[PDB]
Assembly symmetry: C2
Homo-oligomer: 109 residues x 2
């Protein structure tokens, strides 16, 4: 069985405080809605932000949101803040092995 | 609902090539068997090694194995190899939000 390949773009981004930022993920096969988004700050374990494409988890600020279906999904930060500097990942769980996108490093200009 | 907290030990380990290495992960509540193990090399995304406590994924060397149930789980490398140097994490998926242990950094002496 071929793995499902997740393609994330862009691989790095720098923006100013208060700007809007979007990250996309595309799957090589339809995964219906089974996609998660994680945040990882340096030296730390990943933290689940959004479950099943669009369900925001507890303790996550409302300026984060997720959308999409089929093969194409989007992660949005409506107003970038300093504490948001991290690497962000998408992950599919439609089929084993679960795979991650390559990651987007976010930095402030 | 309280989160389920995962406690991983040790947080860091140094060992020689050919040694046996074990990493433990304990949950603050019974998670039955719903625990995954991931490998992460620096600058790279995590890779799923083991699903539902003991099911080894494709492409993974047979020197890796997983065991446990209830609240206590173990990850074993039967013979440490240089390509094994990475950070390893456990993750529960019995309840949302899914949580990770703090990670074990593995290095060679």
């Amino acid at each position: 069985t071929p793995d499902i390949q997740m393609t994330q773009s862009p691989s790095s981004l720098s923006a100013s405080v208060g700007d809007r930022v979007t990250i996309t993920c595309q799957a090589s096969q339809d995964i219906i809605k089974y996609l998660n988004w994680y945040q990882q700050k340096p030296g730390k374990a990943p933290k689940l932000l959004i479950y099943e494409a669009s369900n925001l988890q507890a303790g996550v600020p409302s300026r984060f949101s997720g959308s999409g279906s089929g093969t194409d999904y989007t992660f949005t930060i409506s107003s970038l803040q300093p504490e948001d500097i991290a690497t962000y990942y998408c992950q599919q769980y439609q089929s084993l092995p679960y795979t991650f996108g390559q990651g987007t490093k976010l930095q402030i200009t």
